[PDB]
């Protein structure tokens, strides 16, 4: 209904991905060789501009989503209207605990399976001395 925490996480992921996309497109257009290649007639630059436009659309929709989530965050001002900045320096959850215990049991089971898989998977280290 609110998902403000997930909204902030998505916004952070989006701005990080925007920076990543900037770096990637710089690395991409870095080796922009002569379009009129001696050997290559029309091969490279086509896919180059294709990926260029793709990354452009990507960063455009990224900016759009950023603006949208920022507007959503700044509009839904519910809870702690004062919001004391000086309140960040120190001097039911039953279902959560049940899900955590179930996940831990599944993790231990998977770990036992992986432990068995270790011995079942080495399988060559002991007998590579005479393997062919």
């Amino acid at each position: 209904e609110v998902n403000t925490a997930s909204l902030c996480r998505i916004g952070q992921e989006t701005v990080q991905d925007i920076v990543y996309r900037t770096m990637e497109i710089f690395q991409l257009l870095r080796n922009m060789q002569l379009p009129n290649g001696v050997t290559y007639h029309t091969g490279t630059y086509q896919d180059r501009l294709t990926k260029l436009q793709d990354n452009l659309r990507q960063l455009s929709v990224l900016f759009r989503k950023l603006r949208l989530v920022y507007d959503k965050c700044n509009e839904n001002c519910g809870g702690m209207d004062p919001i004391p900045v000086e309140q960040l320096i120190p001097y039911e959850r039953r279902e959560i605990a049940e899900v955590n215990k179930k996940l831990k049991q599944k993790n231990q089971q998977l770990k036992q399976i992986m432990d068995q898989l270790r011995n079942l998977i080495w399988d060559i280290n002991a007998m590579l001395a005479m393997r062919n």
């Binding site: 002569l34 379009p35 009129n36 001696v38 501009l49 260029l52 436009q53 452009l56 455009s60």
Partner: protein, 123 residues
Amino acid sequence: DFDPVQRYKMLIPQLKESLQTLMKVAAQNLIQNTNIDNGQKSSDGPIQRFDKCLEEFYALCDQLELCLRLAHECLSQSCDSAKHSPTLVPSLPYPQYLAVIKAQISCAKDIHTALLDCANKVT
């Protein structure tokens, strides 16, 4: 039919001697006024007004700078052409060269248009 670099080489002594003569006539005018203002009627020798010499020095400096800039532009153009174009001076015909040039120009224009559209979408 004179090459730029050899002209600059052969012209360096000219700038040197002109600067020397400039300093000489400057010293002449200085000692002249220095004997005139406080000494006696001794310095009676009309030398150069020191304007022509300075103007000539500046003009030679400017001409040398122009020649050097022209040589630099020419060599930079030759270098970039060699680095971003194969050897085709009739294994490719001249029309192929012109076509390649036009295609590269069109690709550059397309890149420019794409960047302009990106800037527009940004705003």
